[PDB]
RNA sequence: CUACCCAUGUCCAGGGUGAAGUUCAGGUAACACUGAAUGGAGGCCCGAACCCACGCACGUUGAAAAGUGCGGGGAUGAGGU
RNA sequence: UGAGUAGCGAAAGAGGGGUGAGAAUCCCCUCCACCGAAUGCCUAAGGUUUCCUGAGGAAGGCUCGUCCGCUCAGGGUUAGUCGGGACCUAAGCCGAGGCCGAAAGGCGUAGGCGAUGGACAACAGGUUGAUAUUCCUGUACCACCUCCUCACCAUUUGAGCAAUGGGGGGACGCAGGAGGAUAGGGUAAGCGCGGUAUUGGAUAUCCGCGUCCAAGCAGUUAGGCUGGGAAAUAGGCAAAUCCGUUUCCCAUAAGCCUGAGCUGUGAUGGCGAGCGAAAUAUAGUAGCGAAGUUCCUGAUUCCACACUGCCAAGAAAAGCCUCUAGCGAGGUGAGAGGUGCCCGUACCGCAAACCGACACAGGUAGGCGAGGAGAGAAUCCUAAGGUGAUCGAGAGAACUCUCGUUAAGGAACUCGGCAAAAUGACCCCGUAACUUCGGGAGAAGGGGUGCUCUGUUAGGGUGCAAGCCCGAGAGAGCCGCAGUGAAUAGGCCCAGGCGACUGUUUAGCAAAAACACAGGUCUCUGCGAAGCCGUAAGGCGAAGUAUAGGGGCUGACGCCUGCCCGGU
């Protein structure tokens, strides 16, 4: 702790993930309290493919509703992360 | 014309907010009656 | 001197500003400006305990020896400058130490005059020395009370004092407005009546110069509601009804003496308040 | 919200009136004094943004729990924000 | 119940097609119309997804409704340089110790927080159905550190770091006006269009455009400095080669510090009028892309609170430059090469997304804010842009409101010229009583203006000329009822009462003869203060000192302010 593995959770597969993944940049959610340089700790040590850049957004939650019962989505914090040239990718495959 | 809730993030949170009512002993009685009643929104 | 304004509008029809001949330079010493906050008649609580102050222009204090603790080394008046914190002006002095000190300006001085401040010093206007060495009958200002405290006594523009005749302890002083106080003898004092003598004849003229200074306006006695002020009432412009005129507190303000009767100044007066 | 204060920023389209002060020509013995040009100060003058709230009409279970339409006062200051 | 009644919340749509079961209200196109110193854009206060797509449509939409800011289902905000925190401080707040007080607490030192301030490194394009001085494409810049390379010192007879220590500097008001430059706008050169069917125009005819950074170099309008050097110091807690004080030398500018902007650079880049292919999960984009200059006008910006003047005399600490104390053995510099965090980034921000119970003719900082006429942000009409304001149809009555005409008479109406009508822009003539000598006074009362020509007028600004602009003044002549033909621009003039005046007040009936006001006074107060708020501590008064504060009375100016101390 803080390990590389628990920092990331998933890749986020949207229409944005179609065009960005062909340009050596990849989407990942990160935990709520994990900074930019903890993300470079992951991809170097989990994936072995060296980071070009880390760019981190965060979102607030949409307060959805079901019936009478209204409540708020958990807050999300994604990360567009770029890699070097001459370096592969270790996605779903 | 002008009405009385000219909204502020700062001035609302400083007059009425939390640590302002953990400040004084009379201000914490406001945080006692907000607890023995058992409201959800403790002081706004 | 005092100029007078030609009535170009109705703001001007009485107003006078002084000639500003005594002053030499505008931009003061940067290294003795002390900053100020206009307080506005407020208290340390926050209540406004002084009526009708506030409104003024941005003042900025300049540090003044009202003591002249340093001694013997002659001064050499560089410039005489203007200070919004009081009536009179201030003369900048370059001592031979380099201790550039704003020190209150008596009349008759210009650039270049020697000003010592020892007990050995002269009776040239400006020189300062304790009251034992002062001879009977000189024009003195900047008097203190306790030795070395600071010149609480006389300071304002165009005022002075005397020395009537003294002992070892104390030195009698006919102060301004006639009070003869047995002022202590080793009290440091300085010599001369205070410059800018024509401050009184300055006709203010237009209303807002008392707001420029500033002073908030005052609301009189039979104007406020009979709640708020103990003269007010009537069906408008009623006579000043109740016996013993009365402040906005219940105390008469025609001649009702306000000195403590049991007070330290029962010994320290030979003659008081000629009225 | 509003009354007052304090600290710090910000706003005031345009054009007029012309003083103090100066310079020059004249003037006395020096002053005084007088006229030209220069000069732009002023809770000055007009008038818009802005602020106010005197008329009138309307509206009055209103578009509006205080406004709207024509007009109006202040508009470099004791100013508005 | 009233009652299918009041109301449907200012403000032009119309026509064709399409969608669908259904269309005036949905979409597209084409005509027309409105704001255009706002109804435009950009971004705060706030709001918390209202943004985009794909479906629905019961409910909220003041009516329908295939539609929505409604419902669902997904998608949506990328920052070392932008705002804010790893910087500092203002009023204020909190406050170890401390001081007062039955308690709780009140205040407050050292300290620290707290921008609306000070300091501060990035820019021009592209880009999507959604984000941009973030992604990306080119340049840059900022700080830190060295696995590296070189350059230069010195080895405590010491390179350098040099401070929370000392200085300096940051560092500041308002008014006015030159200059100088840029934004911005418009002719002549050019380059792509084009020759028009309604008379005439291959013709000085028409349409459109005409560019561009931050960093870098180089100098510059111009601004300061008070001049610069040497020498000595009763100072600056301690120190100082720093600053301040004093003595000489040189003073026509040598020397410094700062600059708006110009110029090749930046760029053999990338926009650009327009050509808009393949058809593509038919956005129709990609792609292709000529000239791209001179001239004139020009600020409400900048140089710059710089200059001049005026008084009412105009924030503080660090970033930054120095000088010591102390470190100190390997350091300074250059290039290569690394590191660079947290939050904020969607969308509305004069609105249908906020404050108004409402998608309510209201209220909401600041920065951009064009053309013709014009002084101007006036006012009108238009480009840039945005908008058709979400019940309409069709009669043309009473009556209400909003307006516009009215013959003849004009205040007879009325408490009252309430109200309307009227006057108004420049230029010129001319202008009284009265006065505090400034005014009054835009007093009053009058005359001129449209166009053509003489005439690239006279003469100025600018330019070398060419060329534009800016143009009084006049003579001839034209036409109209009308010449500031429209819109916006004062109605005056006597005589009175009150109040000097500009101002302020009863937010939401009363702006006034009320209050303020300068001036006048009477009085108290010698400073641990008179009065204050405090139970007191503390603080105002005040880094004030009887030419100053507090209290009262009266209210510019002029003439004055007569009599009674019995009462109280």
From Swiss-Prot, chain A:
Part of the 50S ribosomal subunit. Contacts protein L29, and trigger factor when it is bound to the ribosome. Keywords: Ribonucleoprotein, Ribosomal protein, RNA-binding, rRNA-binding. GO terms for molecular function: rRNA binding; structural constituent of ribosome. One of the early assembly proteins it binds 23S rRNA. One of the proteins that surrounds the polypeptide exit tunnel on the outside of the ribosome. Forms the main docking site for trigger factor binding to the ribosome. GO terms for cellular component: cytosolic large ribosomal subunit. The keyword GTP-binding does not apply. PROSITE patterns: RIBOSOMAL_L23 (PS00050). The keyword Metal-binding does not apply. GO terms for biological process: translation. This is Large ribosomal subunit protein uL23. It comes from Bacillus subtilis (strain 168). Belongs to the universal ribosomal protein uL23 family.
Swiss-Prot record, chain B:
One of its GO terms (cellular component) is ribosome. One of its GO terms (biological process) is translation. InterPro entries: Ribosomal_bL34 (IPR000271), Ribosomal_bL34_CS (IPR020939). GO terms for molecular function: structural constituent of ribosome. Transmembrane segments: none annotated. Keywords: Ribonucleoprotein, Ribosomal protein. Residues 1-19 have a biased composition (Basic residues). Pfam families: Ribosomal_L34. Residues 1-27 are annotated as: Disordered. It comes from the Bacteria. Part of the 50S ribosomal subunit. Belongs to the bacterial ribosomal protein bL34 family. PANTHER family: LARGE RIBOSOMAL SUBUNIT PROTEIN BL34M (PTHR14503:SF4), MITOCHONDRIAL RIBOSOMAL PROTEIN 34 FAMILY MEMBER (PTHR14503). This is Large ribosomal subunit protein bL34. It comes from Bacillus subtilis (strain 168).
Swiss-Prot record, chain C:
Residues 218-275 are annotated as: Disordered. GO terms for molecular function: RNA binding; rRNA binding; structural constituent of ribosome; transferase activity. It holds the Pfam family Ribosomal_L2_C. The keyword Ribosomal protein applies. The keyword Ribosomal protein applies. Keywords: Ribonucleoprotein, Ribosomal protein, RNA-binding, rRNA-binding. Gene3D superfamilies: 2.30.30.30, Nucleic acid-binding proteins, Ribosomal protein L2, domain 3. GO terms for cellular component: large ribosomal subunit. Residues 257-275 have a biased composition (Basic residues). GO terms for biological process: cytoplasmic translation. InterPro entries: NA-bd_OB-fold, Rib_uL2_dom2, Ribosomal_uL2, Ribosomal_uL2_bac/org-type, Ribosomal_uL2_C, Ribosomal_uL2_CS, Ribosomal_uL2_dom3, Ribosomal_uL2_RNA-bd_dom. Belongs to the universal ribosomal protein uL2 family. One of the primary rRNA binding proteins. Required for association of the 30S and 50S subunits to form the 70S ribosome, for tRNA binding and peptide bond formation. It has been suggested to have peptidyltransferase activity; this is somewhat controversial. Makes several contacts with the 16S rRNA in the 70S ribosome. Part of the 50S ribosomal subunit. Forms a bridge to the 30S subunit in the 70S ribosome. PANTHER family: LARGE RIBOSOMAL SUBUNIT PROTEIN UL2M, RIBOSOMAL PROTEIN L2. HAMAP family: Ribosomal_uL2_B. This is Large ribosomal subunit protein uL2.
């Amino acid at each position: 702790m803080k390990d590389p593995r628990d920092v990331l959770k998933r890749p986020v597969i949207t229409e944005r993930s179609a065009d960005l993944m062909t340009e050596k940049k990849y989407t990942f959610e990160v935990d709520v309290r994990a900074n930019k340089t903890e993300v470079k700790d992951a991809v170097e040590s989990i994936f072995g493919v060296k980071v070009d850049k880390v760019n981190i957004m965060n979102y607030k939650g949409k307060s959805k509703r079901v019936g009478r019962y209204t409540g708020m989505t958990s807050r999300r914090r994604k990360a567009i992360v770029k890699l070097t040239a001459d370096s592969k990718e270790i996605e779903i495959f | 014309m002008k009405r009385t809730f000219q909204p502020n993030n700062r001035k609302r949170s400083k007059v009425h907010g939390f640590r302002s009512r953990m400040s004084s002993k009379n201000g914490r009685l406001v945080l006692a009656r907000r607890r023995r009643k058992g409201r959800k929104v403790l002081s706004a | 001197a005092i100029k007078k304004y030609k009535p170009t509008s109705n703001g001007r029809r009485g107003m006078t500003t002084s000639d500003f001949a005594e002053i030499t330079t505008d931009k003061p010493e940067k290294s003795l400006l002390a900053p100020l906050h206009k307080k506005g008649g407020r208290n340390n609580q926050g209540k406004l305990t002084v009526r009708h102050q506030g409104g003024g222009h941005k003042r900025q204090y300049r540090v003044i020896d009202f003591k002249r603790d340093k001694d013997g080394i002659p001064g050499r008046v560089a410039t005489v400058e203007y200070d919004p914190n009081r009536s009179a002006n201030i003369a900048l002095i370059n001592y031979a130490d380099g201790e550039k000190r704003y020190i209150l300006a008596p009349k008759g001085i210009q650039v270049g005059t020697e000003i010592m401040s020892g007990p050995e010093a002269d009776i040239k206007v400006g020189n300062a020395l304790p009251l034992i060495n002062i001879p009977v009958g000189t024009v003195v200002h900047n008097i203190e009370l306790k030795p070395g405290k600071g010149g609480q006594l006389v300071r304002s523009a165009g005022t002075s004092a005397q020395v009537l005749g003294k002992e070892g302890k104390y030195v009698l002083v006919r102060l301004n407005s006639g009070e003869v106080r047995m002022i202590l003898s080793a009290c440091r004092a300085s010599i001369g009546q205070v410059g800018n003598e024509q401050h009184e004849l300055i006709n203010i003229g237009k209303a807002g110069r008392s707001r420029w200074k500033g002073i908030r306006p005052t609301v009189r006695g039979s104007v406020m509601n009979p709640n708020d002020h103990p003269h007010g009432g009537g069906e408008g412009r009623a006579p000043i009804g109740r016996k013993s005129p009365m402040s906005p507190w219940g105390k008469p303000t025609l001649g009702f003496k306000t000195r403590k009767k049991k007070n330290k100044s029962d010994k320290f007066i030979v003659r008081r308040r000629k009225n």
